[PDB]
Design a protein around this motif. Sequence first.
Motif, PDB file in Angstrom:
ATOM      1  N   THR A   1      -9.028 -25.350 -17.770  1.00  0.00           N
ATOM      2  CA  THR A   1      -8.534 -26.637 -18.260  1.00  0.00           C
ATOM      3  C   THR A   1      -9.484 -27.324 -19.228  1.00  0.00           C
ATOM      4  O   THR A   1      -9.246 -28.488 -19.601  1.00  0.00           O
ATOM      5  N   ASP A   2     -10.549 -26.627 -19.613  1.00  0.00           N
ATOM      6  CA  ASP A   2     -11.497 -27.145 -20.612  1.00  0.00           C
ATOM      7  C   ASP A   2     -12.023 -28.537 -20.233  1.00  0.00           C
ATOM      8  O   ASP A   2     -11.951 -29.471 -21.035  1.00  0.00           O
ATOM      9  N   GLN A   3     -12.551 -28.679 -19.024  1.00  0.00           N
ATOM     10  CA  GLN A   3     -13.123 -29.960 -18.625  1.00  0.00           C
ATOM     11  C   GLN A   3     -14.267 -29.778 -17.655  1.00  0.00           C
ATOM     12  O   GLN A   3     -14.338 -28.758 -16.934  1.00  0.00           O
ATOM     13  N   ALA A   4     -15.160 -30.761 -17.610  1.00  0.00           N
ATOM     14  CA  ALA A   4     -16.244 -30.716 -16.638  1.00  0.00           C
ATOM     15  C   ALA A   4     -15.781 -31.396 -15.367  1.00  0.00           C
ATOM     16  O   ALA A   4     -15.140 -32.453 -15.410  1.00  0.00           O
TER      17      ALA A   4
ATOM     18  N   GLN B   1     -21.836 -29.773 -10.440  1.00  0.00           N
ATOM     19  CA  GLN B   1     -20.964 -29.843 -11.611  1.00  0.00           C
ATOM     20  C   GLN B   1     -20.665 -28.454 -12.153  1.00  0.00           C
ATOM     21  O   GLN B   1     -21.556 -27.599 -12.226  1.00  0.00           O
TER      22      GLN B   1
ATOM     23  N   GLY C   1     -18.324 -35.075  -5.517  1.00  0.00           N
ATOM     24  CA  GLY C   1     -18.241 -36.499  -5.245  1.00  0.00           C
ATOM     25  C   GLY C   1     -19.589 -37.122  -4.975  1.00  0.00           C
ATOM     26  O   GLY C   1     -19.687 -38.351  -4.838  1.00  0.00           O
TER      27      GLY C   1
ATOM     28  N   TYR D   1     -27.395 -32.470 -10.540  1.00  0.00           N
ATOM     29  CA  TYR D   1     -28.030 -33.690 -11.039  1.00  0.00           C
ATOM     30  C   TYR D   1     -28.551 -34.523  -9.890  1.00  0.00           C
ATOM     31  O   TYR D   1     -27.950 -34.553  -8.817  1.00  0.00           O
TER      32      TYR D   1
ATOM     33  N   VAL E   1     -20.897 -20.612 -13.089  1.00  0.00           N
ATOM     34  CA  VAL E   1     -22.242 -21.170 -13.029  1.00  0.00           C
ATOM     35  C   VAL E   1     -22.181 -22.637 -12.641  1.00  0.00           C
ATOM     36  O   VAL E   1     -21.324 -23.386 -13.122  1.00  0.00           O
TER      37      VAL E   1
ATOM     38  N   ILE F   1     -12.972 -23.567 -16.957  1.00  0.00           N
ATOM     39  CA  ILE F   1     -12.467 -22.897 -18.145  1.00  0.00           C
ATOM     40  C   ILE F   1     -10.947 -22.945 -18.261  1.00  0.00           C
ATOM     41  O   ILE F   1     -10.395 -22.902 -19.357  1.00  0.00           O
TER      42      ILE F   1
ATOM     43  N   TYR G   1     -25.448 -34.570  -7.376  1.00  0.00           N
ATOM     44  CA  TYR G   1     -24.109 -34.153  -7.788  1.00  0.00           C
ATOM     45  C   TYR G   1     -24.119 -32.717  -8.274  1.00  0.00           C
ATOM     46  O   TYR G   1     -24.972 -32.342  -9.084  1.00  0.00           O
TER      47      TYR G   1
ATOM     48  N   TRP H   1     -18.015 -26.320 -15.273  1.00  0.00           N
ATOM     49  CA  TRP H   1     -17.071 -26.415 -16.363  1.00  0.00           C
ATOM     50  C   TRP H   1     -15.880 -25.554 -15.981  1.00  0.00           C
ATOM     51  O   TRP H   1     -16.017 -24.344 -15.731  1.00  0.00           O
TER      52      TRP H   1
ATOM     53  N   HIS I   1     -24.239 -26.442 -11.849  1.00  0.00           N
ATOM     54  CA  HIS I   1     -25.380 -27.233 -12.242  1.00  0.00           C
ATOM     55  C   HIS I   1     -25.486 -28.446 -11.333  1.00  0.00           C
ATOM     56  O   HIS I   1     -24.505 -28.860 -10.711  1.00  0.00           O
TER      57      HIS I   1
ATOM     58  N   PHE J   1     -17.152 -32.817 -11.553  1.00  0.00           N
ATOM     59  CA  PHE J   1     -18.252 -33.164 -10.657  1.00  0.00           C
ATOM     60  C   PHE J   1     -17.776 -33.173  -9.217  1.00  0.00           C
ATOM     61  O   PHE J   1     -16.637 -33.558  -8.916  1.00  0.00           O
TER      62      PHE J   1
END
Lengths: 217, 211
Positions: free
Chosen positions: B94-97, B88, B101, B35, B31, B92, B86, B90, B33, B99
Amino acid sequence: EVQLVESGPGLVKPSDILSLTCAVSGYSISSNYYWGWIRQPPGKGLEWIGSIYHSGSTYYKPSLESRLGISVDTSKNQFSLKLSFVSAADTAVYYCARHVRSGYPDTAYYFDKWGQGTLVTVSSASTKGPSVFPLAPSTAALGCLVKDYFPEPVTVSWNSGALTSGVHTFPAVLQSSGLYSLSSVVTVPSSSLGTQTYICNVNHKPSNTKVDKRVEP
Amino acid sequence: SYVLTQPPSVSVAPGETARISCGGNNIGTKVLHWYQQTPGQAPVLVVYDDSDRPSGIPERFSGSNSGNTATLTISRVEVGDEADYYCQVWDISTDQAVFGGGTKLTVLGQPKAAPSVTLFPPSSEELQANKATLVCLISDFYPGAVTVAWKADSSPVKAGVETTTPSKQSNNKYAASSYLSLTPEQWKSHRSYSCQVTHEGSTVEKTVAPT
Protein backbone atom coordinates in the motif's frame (compact mmCIF):
# COMPACT_ATOMS: atom_id res chain seq x y z
CA GLU A 1 24.96 17.96 10.41
CA VAL A 2 21.64 17.40 8.60
CA GLN A 3 18.88 19.44 10.28
CA LEU A 4 15.21 19.95 9.51
CA VAL A 5 12.97 22.74 10.81
CA GLU A 6 9.17 22.96 10.51
CA SER A 7 7.38 26.31 10.21
CA GLY A 8 3.89 27.62 9.66
CA PRO A 9 0.75 28.75 11.48
CA GLY A 10 -0.02 27.27 14.85
CA LEU A 11 -3.79 27.75 14.47
CA VAL A 12 -6.09 26.64 11.61
CA LYS A 13 -9.90 26.94 11.51
CA PRO A 14 -11.96 23.77 10.98
CA SER A 15 -12.52 22.98 7.29
CA ASP A 16 -9.62 25.19 6.17
CA ILE A 17 -6.16 24.14 4.87
CA LEU A 18 -3.27 23.44 7.21
CA SER A 19 0.03 24.47 5.60
CA LEU A 20 3.55 23.81 6.87
CA THR A 21 7.05 24.14 5.41
CA CYS A 22 10.22 22.20 6.25
CA ALA A 23 13.59 23.91 5.71
CA VAL A 24 16.50 21.48 5.31
CA SER A 25 20.12 22.31 6.23
CA GLY A 26 23.29 20.27 5.78
CA TYR A 27 22.17 18.27 2.75
CA SER A 28 20.57 19.19 -0.60
CA ILE A 29 17.13 17.69 -1.24
CA SER A 30 18.05 17.65 -4.93
CA SER A 31 20.79 15.11 -4.20
CA ASN A 32 18.86 12.27 -2.62
CA TYR A 33 16.38 10.80 -0.17
CA TYR A 34 12.66 11.07 0.34
CA TRP A 35 11.44 13.89 2.60
CA GLY A 36 8.22 13.68 4.53
CA TRP A 37 5.90 14.30 7.41
CA ILE A 38 4.85 12.43 10.55
CA ARG A 39 2.45 13.75 13.20
CA GLN A 40 1.47 13.02 16.78
CA PRO A 41 -1.82 14.12 18.28
CA PRO A 42 -1.56 15.12 21.94
CA GLY A 43 -1.05 12.01 24.06
CA LYS A 44 -1.22 9.61 21.09
CA GLY A 45 1.13 7.67 18.86
CA LEU A 46 3.02 8.54 15.71
CA GLU A 47 1.17 8.66 12.37
CA TRP A 48 2.95 8.85 9.02
CA ILE A 49 1.46 11.36 6.57
CA GLY A 50 3.45 11.27 3.34
CA SER A 51 6.71 11.96 1.54
CA ILE A 52 8.24 13.40 -1.62
CA TYR A 53 11.35 12.98 -3.77
CA HIS A 54 13.15 15.84 -5.56
CA SER A 55 11.56 14.80 -8.85
CA GLY A 56 8.13 15.57 -7.41
CA SER A 57 7.13 11.90 -6.97
CA THR A 58 5.04 11.41 -3.81
CA TYR A 59 3.71 8.77 -1.44
CA TYR A 60 0.61 9.75 0.54
CA LYS A 61 -1.03 7.95 3.44
CA PRO A 62 -4.06 6.31 1.75
CA SER A 63 -6.56 7.49 4.39
CA LEU A 64 -5.42 11.09 3.91
CA GLU A 65 -4.64 11.06 0.20
CA SER A 66 -7.84 12.87 -0.83
CA ARG A 67 -6.95 15.77 1.51
CA LEU A 68 -3.18 15.89 1.07
CA GLY A 69 -0.65 17.70 -0.99
CA ILE A 70 3.11 17.66 -0.54
CA SER A 71 5.38 19.83 -2.67
CA VAL A 72 9.13 20.30 -2.99
CA ASP A 73 11.21 23.32 -3.91
CA THR A 74 14.75 22.22 -4.57
CA SER A 75 15.82 25.78 -5.40
CA LYS A 76 15.07 26.84 -1.82
CA ASN A 77 15.94 23.45 -0.24
CA GLN A 78 12.53 23.12 1.35
CA PHE A 79 9.39 20.99 1.08
CA SER A 80 5.86 21.58 2.26
CA LEU A 81 2.62 20.04 3.48
CA LYS A 82 -0.96 21.02 2.75
CA LEU A 83 -3.75 19.16 4.53
CA SER A 84 -7.29 20.25 3.60
CA PHE A 85 -10.66 20.05 5.37
CA VAL A 86 -9.11 19.86 8.81
CA SER A 87 -10.89 19.03 12.08
CA ALA A 88 -9.84 18.72 15.72
CA ALA A 89 -8.54 15.26 14.82
CA ASP A 90 -5.76 17.05 12.95
CA THR A 91 -4.52 18.94 15.99
CA ALA A 92 -1.06 17.49 16.47
CA VAL A 93 2.64 18.05 16.60
CA TYR A 94 3.87 17.83 12.99
CA TYR A 95 7.40 16.59 12.32
CA CYS A 96 9.33 16.65 9.12
CA ALA A 97 11.83 13.83 8.61
CA ARG A 98 14.39 12.49 6.16
CA HIS A 99 13.23 9.16 4.71
CA VAL A 100 16.14 6.81 3.99
CA ARG A 101 15.65 4.00 1.47
CA SER A 102 16.95 0.75 2.98
CA GLY A 103 19.70 -1.09 1.15
CA TYR A 104 17.58 -4.27 1.40
CA PRO A 105 15.89 -5.44 -1.84
CA ASP A 106 12.19 -4.89 -1.08
CA THR A 107 11.21 -1.22 -0.87
CA ALA A 108 11.62 0.12 2.66
CA TYR A 109 11.99 3.55 4.26
CA TYR A 110 12.95 4.62 7.78
CA PHE A 111 13.35 8.06 9.31
CA ASP A 112 16.86 8.95 10.39
CA LYS A 113 16.76 12.75 10.85
CA TRP A 114 13.80 14.57 12.39
CA GLY A 115 12.79 18.16 12.97
CA GLN A 116 11.88 19.30 16.49
CA GLY A 117 8.20 19.41 15.53
CA THR A 118 5.64 22.18 15.47
CA LEU A 119 2.20 22.20 17.09
CA VAL A 120 -0.85 23.01 15.01
CA THR A 121 -4.19 23.44 16.81
CA VAL A 122 -7.40 23.22 14.80
CA SER A 123 -10.07 25.42 16.35
CA SER A 124 -12.63 28.11 15.53
CA ALA A 125 -11.56 30.15 18.58
CA SER A 126 -9.69 33.42 18.11
CA THR A 127 -6.09 33.96 19.14
CA LYS A 128 -5.82 35.63 22.55
CA GLY A 129 -2.70 36.90 24.27
CA PRO A 130 -2.17 36.22 27.96
CA SER A 131 -2.53 38.54 30.90
CA VAL A 132 0.62 38.20 32.99
CA PHE A 133 0.50 38.62 36.77
CA PRO A 134 3.40 38.55 39.21
CA LEU A 135 3.48 35.85 41.87
CA ALA A 136 5.25 37.66 44.69
CA PRO A 137 7.61 35.81 47.04
CA SER A 138 6.82 35.54 50.76
CA THR A 139 15.06 30.62 49.87
CA ALA A 140 12.02 32.17 48.21
CA ALA A 141 9.69 31.04 45.46
CA LEU A 142 8.48 33.72 43.10
CA GLY A 143 6.85 33.53 39.71
CA CYS A 144 4.54 34.64 36.97
CA LEU A 145 1.04 33.51 36.17
CA VAL A 146 0.43 33.52 32.42
CA LYS A 147 -3.33 33.65 32.26
CA ASP A 148 -6.01 32.99 29.61
CA TYR A 149 -4.19 32.62 26.28
CA PHE A 150 -4.88 30.70 23.08
CA PRO A 151 -3.49 28.69 21.38
CA GLU A 152 -0.37 26.95 22.70
CA PRO A 153 2.50 27.48 23.14
CA VAL A 154 3.96 30.19 25.34
CA THR A 155 7.64 30.59 26.20
CA VAL A 156 8.92 31.97 29.51
CA SER A 157 12.42 33.09 30.41
CA TRP A 158 13.74 34.98 33.43
CA ASN A 159 15.96 38.07 33.36
CA SER A 160 16.19 37.80 29.58
CA GLY A 161 17.67 34.32 29.94
CA ALA A 162 20.36 35.27 32.46
CA LEU A 163 18.48 33.34 35.17
CA THR A 164 18.07 29.62 34.47
CA SER A 165 18.92 27.63 37.60
CA GLY A 166 15.91 26.90 39.80
CA VAL A 167 13.41 27.74 37.05
CA HIS A 168 10.40 25.44 36.72
CA THR A 169 7.93 26.32 33.96
CA PHE A 170 4.84 24.17 34.32
CA PRO A 171 2.75 22.62 31.54
CA ALA A 172 -0.41 24.65 30.91
CA VAL A 173 -3.87 23.76 32.07
CA LEU A 174 -6.59 23.78 29.39
CA GLN A 175 -9.61 25.42 30.99
CA SER A 176 -13.23 24.56 30.31
CA SER A 177 -13.39 27.95 28.56
CA GLY A 178 -10.96 26.69 25.92
CA LEU A 179 -8.21 29.07 27.05
CA TYR A 180 -4.90 28.02 28.61
CA SER A 181 -3.00 29.24 31.65
CA LEU A 182 0.45 28.27 32.90
CA SER A 183 2.87 29.35 35.60
CA SER A 184 6.61 29.65 35.84
CA VAL A 185 8.29 29.66 39.24
CA VAL A 186 11.89 30.22 40.20
CA THR A 187 13.47 29.45 43.54
CA VAL A 188 16.03 32.04 44.58
CA PRO A 189 18.01 32.77 47.76
CA SER A 190 15.88 34.67 50.29
CA SER A 191 18.99 36.80 50.84
CA SER A 192 18.83 38.26 47.32
CA LEU A 193 15.31 39.73 47.36
CA GLY A 194 16.32 43.31 48.14
CA THR A 195 19.25 43.40 45.74
CA GLN A 196 18.26 41.34 42.70
CA THR A 197 15.59 42.38 40.19
CA TYR A 198 13.46 39.53 38.82
CA ILE A 199 11.56 39.82 35.55
CA CYS A 200 9.77 37.05 33.72
CA ASN A 201 9.81 37.37 29.95
CA VAL A 202 6.66 35.99 28.37
CA ASN A 203 6.31 35.41 24.65
CA HIS A 204 3.09 34.34 22.95
CA LYS A 205 3.92 34.29 19.24
CA PRO A 206 0.36 33.63 17.96
CA SER A 207 -0.89 36.99 19.33
CA ASN A 208 2.48 38.72 19.01
CA THR A 209 2.35 39.30 22.77
CA LYS A 210 5.58 40.12 24.54
CA VAL A 211 5.35 40.90 28.24
CA ASP A 212 8.10 41.64 30.74
CA LYS A 213 6.71 41.58 34.24
CA ARG A 214 8.89 42.49 37.20
CA VAL A 215 8.07 40.48 40.29
CA GLU A 216 8.49 42.52 43.49
CA PRO A 217 8.43 41.23 47.10
CA SER B 1 -3.41 -1.90 5.92
CA TYR B 2 -0.63 -3.87 7.58
CA VAL B 3 -0.92 -3.91 11.40
CA LEU B 4 1.91 -3.74 13.97
CA THR B 5 1.02 -4.72 17.52
CA GLN B 6 3.05 -3.57 20.53
CA PRO B 7 2.20 -3.94 24.20
CA PRO B 8 1.25 -0.57 25.69
CA SER B 9 3.65 -1.06 28.61
CA VAL B 10 6.80 -2.95 29.68
CA SER B 11 8.50 -2.82 33.10
CA VAL B 12 12.05 -3.90 33.90
CA ALA B 13 14.46 -3.73 36.86
CA PRO B 14 17.56 -1.54 36.48
CA GLY B 15 20.55 -3.37 34.99
CA GLU B 16 18.27 -6.09 33.64
CA THR B 17 17.29 -6.67 30.02
CA ALA B 18 14.11 -5.09 28.64
CA ARG B 19 12.40 -6.74 25.69
CA ILE B 20 9.81 -4.86 23.65
CA SER B 21 7.79 -6.92 21.20
CA CYS B 22 6.29 -5.86 17.88
CA GLY B 23 3.92 -8.38 16.33
CA GLY B 24 2.81 -8.62 12.71
CA ASN B 25 1.71 -11.27 10.20
CA ASN B 26 4.93 -12.57 8.63
CA ILE B 27 6.78 -9.55 10.04
CA GLY B 28 9.99 -11.58 9.64
CA THR B 29 9.76 -11.05 5.88
CA LYS B 30 9.95 -7.25 6.29
CA VAL B 31 12.73 -5.04 7.60
CA LEU B 32 11.72 -3.37 10.86
CA HIS B 33 12.90 -0.13 12.41
CA TRP B 34 12.61 1.30 15.91
CA TYR B 35 12.37 4.77 17.50
CA GLN B 36 12.85 6.04 21.04
CA GLN B 37 10.82 9.08 22.10
CA THR B 38 11.31 10.97 25.33
CA PRO B 39 8.35 13.04 26.59
CA GLY B 40 8.36 16.38 24.77
CA GLN B 41 10.99 15.63 22.12
CA ALA B 42 11.11 14.25 18.58
CA PRO B 43 11.61 10.50 18.17
CA VAL B 44 15.14 9.23 17.59
CA LEU B 45 16.03 6.27 15.35
CA VAL B 46 17.66 3.56 17.48
CA VAL B 47 17.55 0.48 15.21
CA TYR B 48 17.01 0.10 11.48
CA ASP B 49 16.97 -2.88 9.11
CA ASP B 50 15.90 -5.22 11.99
CA SER B 51 19.17 -5.10 13.87
CA ASP B 52 21.51 -2.29 12.81
CA ARG B 53 22.36 0.75 14.95
CA PRO B 54 22.88 4.31 13.72
CA SER B 55 26.19 5.86 14.77
CA GLY B 56 26.00 7.14 18.33
CA ILE B 57 23.38 4.67 19.56
CA PRO B 58 24.73 2.55 22.45
CA GLU B 59 25.46 -1.12 21.77
CA ARG B 60 23.00 -1.89 24.61
CA PHE B 61 20.24 -1.46 22.02
CA SER B 62 19.76 -4.46 19.72
CA GLY B 63 17.02 -5.76 17.50
CA SER B 64 15.77 -9.04 16.09
CA ASN B 65 12.97 -10.07 13.74
CA SER B 66 11.67 -13.50 12.73
CA GLY B 67 8.34 -15.21 12.13
CA ASN B 68 5.41 -13.16 13.42
CA THR B 69 7.22 -11.10 16.08
CA ALA B 70 10.15 -8.67 16.24
CA THR B 71 11.92 -7.52 19.39
CA LEU B 72 13.82 -4.49 20.58
CA THR B 73 16.21 -5.60 23.31
CA ILE B 74 17.75 -3.11 25.73
CA SER B 75 20.57 -4.59 27.84
CA ARG B 76 21.64 -3.25 31.23
CA VAL B 77 18.59 -0.97 31.41
CA GLU B 78 19.09 2.49 32.95
CA VAL B 79 16.46 4.86 34.36
CA GLY B 80 17.44 7.17 31.50
CA ASP B 81 16.03 4.62 29.04
CA GLU B 82 12.48 5.43 30.17
CA ALA B 83 10.72 6.54 27.01
CA ASP B 84 8.13 5.41 24.49
CA TYR B 85 9.45 2.97 21.88
CA TYR B 86 7.85 2.58 18.45
CA CYS B 87 8.34 -0.08 15.78
CA GLN B 88 7.83 0.82 12.13
CA VAL B 89 7.67 -0.86 8.71
CA TRP B 90 7.06 0.19 5.16
CA ASP B 91 4.04 -1.66 3.76
CA ILE B 92 4.88 -2.37 0.11
CA SER B 93 1.37 -3.48 -0.73
CA THR B 94 0.00 0.00 0.00
CA ASP B 95 3.05 2.28 -0.24
CA GLN B 96 2.83 3.64 3.31
CA ALA B 97 4.73 3.63 6.57
CA VAL B 98 3.06 1.91 9.50
CA PHE B 99 3.88 2.45 13.18
CA GLY B 100 3.08 0.29 16.14
CA GLY B 101 1.08 1.96 18.86
CA GLY B 102 4.11 2.46 21.08
CA THR B 103 5.40 0.85 24.27
CA LYS B 104 6.14 2.88 27.39
CA LEU B 105 9.19 1.54 29.20
CA THR B 106 9.16 1.84 32.99
CA VAL B 107 12.28 1.16 35.04
CA LEU B 108 11.39 -0.27 38.44
CA GLY B 109 13.03 0.45 41.78
CA GLN B 110 12.77 4.24 41.68
CA PRO B 111 12.25 5.55 45.22
CA LYS B 112 8.97 7.09 46.32
CA ALA B 113 9.21 10.89 46.48
CA ALA B 114 6.64 13.15 48.14
CA PRO B 115 5.47 16.27 46.27
CA SER B 116 6.75 19.78 46.89
CA VAL B 117 3.77 22.14 46.96
CA THR B 118 3.90 25.89 46.51
CA LEU B 119 0.65 27.85 46.75
CA PHE B 120 0.28 31.50 45.65
CA PRO B 121 -2.61 33.83 46.47
CA PRO B 122 -4.16 36.22 43.94
CA SER B 123 -1.89 39.09 42.97
CA SER B 124 -2.83 42.68 43.81
CA GLU B 125 -2.83 43.32 40.07
CA GLU B 126 -5.33 40.55 39.39
CA LEU B 127 -7.62 41.63 42.23
CA GLN B 128 -7.48 45.16 40.77
CA ALA B 129 -8.76 43.63 37.52
CA ASN B 130 -11.75 42.13 39.41
CA LYS B 131 -10.47 38.53 39.24
CA ALA B 132 -8.64 36.10 41.51
CA THR B 133 -6.68 32.91 40.87
CA LEU B 134 -5.02 30.66 43.45
CA VAL B 135 -2.07 28.77 41.96
CA CYS B 136 -1.00 25.41 43.39
CA LEU B 137 2.28 24.14 41.92
CA ILE B 138 3.21 20.52 42.57
CA SER B 139 6.61 19.06 41.77
CA ASP B 140 9.22 16.39 42.33
CA PHE B 141 6.82 13.51 43.04
CA TYR B 142 7.15 9.80 42.30
CA PRO B 143 5.22 7.74 41.30
CA GLY B 144 3.47 10.10 38.92
CA ALA B 145 -0.03 10.58 40.23
CA VAL B 146 -1.57 12.89 42.81
CA THR B 147 -5.08 14.00 43.62
CA VAL B 148 -5.82 17.61 44.53
CA ALA B 149 -8.56 18.94 46.78
CA TRP B 150 -9.25 22.56 47.62
CA LYS B 151 -10.91 24.06 50.69
CA ALA B 152 -12.32 27.49 51.47
CA ASP B 153 -11.72 27.63 55.21
CA SER B 154 -12.88 24.05 56.02
CA SER B 155 -15.38 23.67 53.14
CA PRO B 156 -14.40 21.56 50.12
CA VAL B 157 -14.66 23.52 46.86
CA LYS B 158 -14.88 21.87 43.41
CA ALA B 159 -16.28 24.74 41.33
CA GLY B 160 -13.61 26.76 39.61
CA VAL B 161 -10.92 24.10 40.00
CA GLU B 162 -8.76 23.13 37.02
CA THR B 163 -5.96 20.59 37.45
CA THR B 164 -3.39 19.35 34.92
CA THR B 165 -2.38 15.80 34.21
CA PRO B 166 0.97 14.78 35.67
CA SER B 167 4.04 15.52 33.53
CA LYS B 168 7.51 13.92 33.57
CA GLN B 169 10.28 16.27 34.80
CA SER B 170 13.18 14.45 33.12
CA ASN B 171 14.67 13.89 36.56
CA ASN B 172 12.09 11.13 36.16
CA LYS B 173 9.92 12.62 38.89
CA TYR B 174 6.61 14.29 38.06
CA ALA B 175 4.90 17.69 38.16
CA ALA B 176 1.35 19.04 38.03
CA SER B 177 -0.56 22.21 38.78
CA SER B 178 -4.00 23.14 40.01
CA TYR B 179 -5.75 26.48 39.73
CA LEU B 180 -8.72 27.78 41.70
CA SER B 181 -10.68 30.64 40.17
CA LEU B 182 -12.53 32.86 42.65
CA THR B 183 -14.22 36.23 42.77
CA PRO B 184 -12.43 38.92 44.80
CA GLU B 185 -15.43 38.74 47.17
CA GLN B 186 -14.91 35.02 47.72
CA TRP B 187 -11.22 35.58 48.40
CA LYS B 188 -12.01 38.30 50.94
CA SER B 189 -14.80 36.49 52.78
CA HIS B 190 -12.77 33.51 54.00
CA ARG B 191 -9.90 33.31 56.49
CA SER B 192 -7.91 31.07 54.19
CA TYR B 193 -7.91 28.70 51.25
CA SER B 194 -6.00 25.42 51.11
CA CYS B 195 -4.60 23.24 48.38
CA GLN B 196 -4.38 19.62 49.57
CA VAL B 197 -2.24 17.25 47.51
CA THR B 198 -2.59 13.54 48.17
CA HIS B 199 0.21 11.26 47.00
CA GLU B 200 0.36 7.55 47.76
CA GLY B 201 -1.89 7.96 50.80
CA SER B 202 -0.08 10.98 52.26
CA THR B 203 -1.50 14.50 52.07
CA VAL B 204 0.59 17.66 51.79
CA GLU B 205 -1.47 20.79 52.51
CA LYS B 206 -0.59 24.45 51.88
CA THR B 207 -2.69 27.44 52.90
CA VAL B 208 -2.86 31.12 51.93
CA ALA B 209 -4.88 33.97 53.39
CA PRO B 210 -5.77 37.53 52.43
CA THR B 211 -2.95 39.82 53.64
